[PDB]
Amino acid sequence: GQPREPQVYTLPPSREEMTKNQVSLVCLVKGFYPSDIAVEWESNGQPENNYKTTPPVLDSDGSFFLYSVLTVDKSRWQQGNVFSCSV
Amino acid sequence: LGGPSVFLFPPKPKDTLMISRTPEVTCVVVDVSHEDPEVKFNWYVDGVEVHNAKTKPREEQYNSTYRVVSVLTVLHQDWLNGKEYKCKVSNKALPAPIEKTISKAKGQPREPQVYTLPPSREEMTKNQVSLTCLVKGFYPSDIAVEWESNGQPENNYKTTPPVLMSDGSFFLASKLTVDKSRWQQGNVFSCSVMHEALHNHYTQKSLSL
Amino acid sequence: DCAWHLGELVWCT
Numbered sequence: 554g555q556p557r558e559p560q561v562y563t564l565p566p567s568r569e570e571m572t573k574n575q576v577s578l579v580c581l582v583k584g585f586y587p588s589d590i591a592v593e594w595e596s597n598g599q600p601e602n603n604y605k606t607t608p609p610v611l612d613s614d615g616s617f618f619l620y621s622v623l624t625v626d627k628s629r630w631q632q633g634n635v636f637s638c639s640v
Numbered sequence: 641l642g643g644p645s646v647f648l649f650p651p652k653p654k655d656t657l658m659i660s661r662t663p664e665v666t667c668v669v670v671d672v673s674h675e676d677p678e679v680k681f682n683w684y685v686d687g688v689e690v691h692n693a694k695t696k697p698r699e700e701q702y703n704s705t706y707r708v709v710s711v712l713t714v715l716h717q718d719w720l721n722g723k724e725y726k727c728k729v730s731n732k733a734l735p736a737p738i739e740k741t742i743s744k745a746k747g748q749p750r751e752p753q754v755y756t757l758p759p760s761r762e763e764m765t766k767n768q769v770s771l772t773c774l775v776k777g778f779y780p781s782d783i784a785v786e787w788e789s790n791g792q793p794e795n796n797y798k799t800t801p802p803v804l805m806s807d808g809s810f811f812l813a814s815k816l817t818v819d820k821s822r823w824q825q826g827n828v829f830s831c832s833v834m835h836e837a838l839h840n841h842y843t844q845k846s847l848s849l
Numbered sequence: 850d851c852a853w854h855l856g857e858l859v860w861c862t
């Protein structure tokens with residue numbers, strides 16, 4: 554098919570997850586075709602490596618989506634630096 | 641060309657976790673010849689032979705082979721207790737009978753943590769939006785995730801495979817797509833999750849605008 | 850107690 558540009562959203566931790574020593578930052582990448590894509594995470598210019606990215610899933614409109622989850626010490630979600638997802 | 645191969649399947653998670661459903665293990669025999677369609681099945685539960693398995697109708701594959709299937713009902717708690725299920729398959733195109741064993745994964749079960757996350761601000765400009773149910777820290781990876789609104793299943797969601805986290809437990813995310821206007825209305829959406837480690841195998845989390 | 854999911858019984862203890 555014709556290629557499709559992904560929409561990329563970074564979702565913050567749920568107020569409910571704030572009870573743990575670590576929180577999850579969630580990246581939703583959706584509406585992409587083909588299924589080959591690279592997700593990177595950064596905080597104030599530095600690479601973040603403690604993440605897992607799901608394989609692409611075929612979506613109902615025939616594009617793919619995926620999610621990437623960065624797990625970070627909750628200390629740091631309280632030091633403040635913006636964590637951000639990129640393709 | 642063969643002869644046969646045996647695939648042993650476990651129950652669906654939803655059937656092992658719901659007392660109102662019936663879990664079964666399924667012993668599937670493929671590449672059974674037309675010359676020798678006759679298959680003998682032996683079943684065992686933790687090494688002990690059982691006799692309550694039932695053979696399904698033989699299925700013509702139209703490729704010179706039949707598919708021959710034996711089904712064994714399992715007790716919910718037996719599965720969840722980790723008992724071993726063995727299917728032994730004999731057939732004249734087989735030098736030795738084939739044995740296959742399955743059970744629940746071995747490891748300390750871990751409760752999933754379930755968090756629902758609203759669409760991003762950035763998504764509010766589109767015709768449909770995404771509600772995310774993040775389910776993390778679970779073990780083993782057998783899990784059911786569904787969504788609902790006002791009593792009724794939502795069908796328009798997709799769920800990633802479980803993905804293995806470094807600590808040996810799993811996570812996944814389920815994405816429910818709804819018209820931006822259904823979200824705008826302030827309707828309550830729920831992510832229901834079934835897993836062995838939750839109290840009574842069930843949790844539900846909701847969110848709205 | 851018991852869990853229900855959509856009016857179907859999940860589990861009780």
Ligand SMILES: *[C@@H]1O[C@H](CO[C@@H]2O[C@@H](C)[C@@H](O)[C@@H](O)[C@@H]2O)[C@@H](O[C@@H]2O[C@H](CO)[C@@H](O[C@@H]3O[C@H](CO[C@H]4O[C@H](CO)[C@@H](O)[C@H](O)[C@@H]4O[C@@H]4O[C@H](CO)[C@@H](O[C@@H]5O[C@H](CO)[C@H](O)[C@H](O)[C@H]5O)[C@H](O)[C@H]4NC(C)=O)[C@@H](O)[C@H](O[C@H]4O[C@H](CO)[C@@H](O)[C@H](O)[C@@H]4O)[C@@H]3O)[C@H](O)[C@H]2NC(C)=O)[C@H](O)[C@H]1NC(C)=O
Nearest residue numbers: 647649650651652663664665666668670671701703705707
């Ligand atoms: C002649 O044809 C037959 C039939 O094949 C079909 O027809 C032909 C014309 C073609 O169109 C084929 O594409 C069709 O398959 C051929 O039979 C096939 O042989 C394959 C091996 O040669 C065998 O491959 C192995 O498949 C395993 C997975 O099987 C799953 O998934 C497939 C789809 O992926 C599905 O079609 C299969 O039936 C089977 O489906 C699951 O079945 C179980 C049990 O029925 C279900 O679980 C039960 O469900 C009930 C309710 O329904 C309830 O929940 C119960 O509690 C529960 O137990 C389950 O839900 C089904 N799931 C799905 C998703 O459908 C693989 O795991 C296996 O991989 C392993 O082995 C490999 C090496 O072989 C390794 O590489 C690998 O790493 C793994 O270890 C193989 O891929 C096919 O399944 C089989 N097809 C069928 C339909 O049986 C035959 O090969 C051919 N012969 C010749 C000589 O040409």
